[PDB]
Amino acid sequence: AGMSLTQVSGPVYVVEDNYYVQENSMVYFGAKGVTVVGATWTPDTARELHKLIKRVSRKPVLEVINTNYHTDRAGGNAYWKSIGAKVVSTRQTRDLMKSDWAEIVAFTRKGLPEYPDLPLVLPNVVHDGDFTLQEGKVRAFYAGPAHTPDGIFVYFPDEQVLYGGCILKEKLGNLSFADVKAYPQTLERLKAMKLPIKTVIGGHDSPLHGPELIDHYEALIKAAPQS
Template sequence: MTYKLPILILFFAFTLLSCKSHKTRTTYSSETLKIIPVSKNSFIHISYLSTDDYGKVACNGLVYMNDGEAVVFDTPTDKETSNELIQWITKTKQHKIKAVFANHFHDDCLGGIEAFHELNIPSYANNATIELAKKEGNPVPQISFDTEKELTLGNKKIINRHFGEAHTKDNIVSYIPSEHLLFGGCPVKSLNATKGYLGDANIEEWSKTIAKIKTAYPDLKIVIPGHGDYGDIELLDYTITLFKTGQSPK
């Protein structure tokens, strides 16, 4: 008896520790959509895009929930997968979707926006995103903002802001102060990632833009890139270094 108790405690401690290190545990998984919890109220959604240059690419978005409501950051890549995500939020998690935000005008951000519009869920993007999406022939978000759009879910703030050009000229980031969380999208790279698609990028400004984000939000604990694994503020440092001018291109 006296020997068993410490062994049990050790066993549970070990189990807890090993769970904690399992960063990529999924709470939902299908052929087309994966959902990964990153904090009590935040979930990464991952959907897939077929591209000519990079093959099948996994794309990250975010769902943030509070007080019975949810906000979605970037749609899954198409309408069907967006409906799959909407089902999970509204049926499984029983949350009402208040808004959807697009990080920039590419279809890995707004490819499924029609699914939200059909359910009268308002979509937001900055002026440049709306303009560029129209030009590109992509689905177009409904409500535009200038540099910054703040929203509240219950008593929790969400700040969407354009800091400058990077992956595209219109790209924003979304910051949730209560979670110390940044959904960076494509302007933010996962550790060891390459520069990716640069067709619409501003590689001179990229590092400066990310440095501004780091200065504005020094308390970040969770940073989510557009593709690949999430991490902490280190992702901002990695991205700043990757695009420092004078560095050899990867």
């Protein structure tokens, strides 16, 4: 299918968004409503995710987290706002989105000419530090710069699932926005937290991995140019 929504553990689901270059995002089905982690590529892909959500739950979509300011994590924002969901990020992500959205849309369209020229749609709930949702069961945090300066992790403690958006994946990927020397330092700050982790969801490539995806990507980025 163009997009799938599949249970990984309990209320934690993975979105495989096969539009453009495949990106994987998360959905958490909570008591009061639904939290989406990663807005998906465009308002149209966001609508496709919402259609899948409505086959699982009638509860409202409460909020969507932009794990960084890029098009694959924030492009769906216009749709989420339109249905009354909050769009949530760190202040750093929001500020970078304000200044750099035009640049990232242009960069996206260089690789994907078919991708739309999306207007800026900023987060309307901004956090200055780490933050939680769903009565503490969805936990967002910053551990330093990596793939972009601002990317955050989202941890689901009950299910021992870690999502890093674009930070964790199988292939090296684009480093044009990256801090190549800080990247492994951020991954080591992450590992030093000693979070119980059964599953890491990669943000690109095949999503389902164990904790070893962190070490896999760390070894790749240490061999990269500018390391």
